[PDB]
Write an enzyme that holds these catalytic residues in place. Structure first.
Site, PDB file in Angstrom:
ATOM      1  CG  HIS A 133       3.189  84.867  42.374  1.00  0.00           C
ATOM      2  ND1 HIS A 133       3.363  84.906  43.743  1.00  0.00           N
ATOM      3  CD2 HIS A 133       3.045  86.155  41.977  1.00  0.00           C
ATOM      4  CE1 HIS A 133       3.295  86.163  44.157  1.00  0.00           C
ATOM      5  NE2 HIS A 133       3.125  86.947  43.099  1.00  0.00           N
ATOM      6  CG  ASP A 174       4.068  81.373  45.067  1.00  0.00           C
ATOM      7  OD1 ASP A 174       4.919  81.434  44.158  1.00  0.00           O
ATOM      8  OD2 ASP A 174       3.341  82.328  45.388  1.00  0.00           O
ATOM      9  CB  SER A 198       4.943  88.695  45.536  1.00  0.00           C
ATOM     10  OG  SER A 198       3.560  88.784  45.846  1.00  0.00           O
ATOM     11  N   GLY A 199       7.387  87.224  46.962  1.00  0.00           N
ATOM     12  CA  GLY A 199       8.674  86.574  46.797  1.00  0.00           C
ATOM     13  C   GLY A 199       9.606  87.080  47.893  1.00  0.00           C
TER      14      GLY A 199
END
Ligand code: D91
Ligand code: CA
Ligand code: CA
Lengths: 54, 233
Positions: B42, B88, B185-186
């Site tokens: 994402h 993801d 995120s990530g």
């Protein structure tokens, strides 16, 4: 009844495996298993998984 | 990160930051080796083209010790779905290798069974990032860390409006105002064992940031160890 890898990670510094009915310890990439076969010794600087500070 | 503490000198060295054309942080990552960064799939839709910054703690100044790297190859998981957020996970190969030093160093990849039997059964892990400091706030200029308890699978499906797949796991607090948030995120979720930090998750999603009765949802790294290996060749 907690045995082998289930008892305190089998004395291993990192990965433990119950192989037959005994503990076999091993280490992430960039470490070698010490002579005692439990401790993991870094082969270079900047080994993985260490804060850059000690 | 909402709440948490600053990463002090040397404490979060595996953190990468993905930066857009404007050199603005939009997502995080984990250094795996001198060539390869782990992030969320994402994150690769949040900018047309991007670079990777490492060794940064304070994006406002230039400490020295920071380096941009250009991405050579993006490997996105074949099954990623924007719509379920399942699988993801992506790996980036850098054009030039990371130079390890103070504040720049890899987190270890665990073995699967050991990770699931020992790491994911610890009480807490540490997630870290330049992300937003509250749901409605601005991104942090300092790099932050936060200790987050593992959440029981059931409870966390119970809490969730969306499906929690076997590729995901929940961590954080029911009511305490601490959580990852947009921008994190990530980024890394790592679990400490004796004195080694192992990657265990990737900051993927949550319903808001630090909402009561909601948790943070992480990609389960142990489900993709073989795949990460392939990707890295
Ligand atoms: C809002 C919250 N964000 S966020 O602020 O970027 C965010 C990321 C993140 C990570 C962790 Cl570990 C904790 C908090 C957190 N907050 C994602 C989009 N939002 C959503 O609320 C949202 N996300 C996902 C989905 C979703 C999930 C699964 N399947 C389909 C849709 C729906 N809505
Ligand atoms: Ca800086
Ligand atoms: Ca919460």
């Amino acid at each position: 009844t907690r045995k082998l890898c289930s008892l305190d990670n089998g004395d291993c510094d990192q990965f433990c495996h119950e192989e037959q009915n005994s503990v076999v310890c091993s280490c992430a990439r960039g470490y070698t298993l010490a002579d005692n076969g439990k401790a993991c010794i870094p082969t270079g600087p900047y080994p993985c998984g260490k804060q850059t500070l000690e | 990160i909402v709440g948490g503490q600053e990463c002090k000198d040397g404490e979060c060295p595996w953190q990468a930051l993905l930066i857009n054309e404007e050199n603005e942080g939009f997502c995080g990552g984990t250094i795996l080796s001198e060539f390869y960064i782990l992030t969320a799939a994402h994150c690769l839709y949040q900018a047309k083209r991007f670079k990777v910054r490492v060794g940064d703690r304070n994006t406002e100044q230039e400490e020295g010790g920071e380096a941009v790297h250009e991405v050579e190859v993006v490997i996105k998981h074949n099954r990623f779905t924007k719509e379920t957020y399942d699988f993801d996970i992506a790996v980036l190969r850098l054009k030039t290798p990371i130079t390890f030093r103070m504040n720049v160093a890899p987190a270890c990849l665990p073995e699967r069974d050991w990770a699931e039997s020992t790491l994911m059964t610890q009480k807490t892990g540490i997630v870290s990032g330049f992300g937003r400091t509250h749901e409605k706030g601005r991104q942090s200029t300092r790099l932050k860390m936060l200790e987050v308890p593992y959440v029981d699978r059931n409870s966390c499906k119970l809490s969730s409006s969306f499906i929690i797949t076997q590729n995901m796991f929940c961590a954080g607090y029911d009511t305490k105002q601490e959580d990852a948030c947009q921008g994190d995120s990530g980024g890394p979720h790592v679990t400490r064992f004796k004195d080694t930090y192992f990657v265990t998750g990737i900051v993927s999603w949550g319903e808001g940031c630090a909402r009561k009765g909601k948790y943070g949802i992480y990609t389960k790294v142990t489900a993709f160890l073989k795949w990460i290996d392939r990707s890295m060749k």
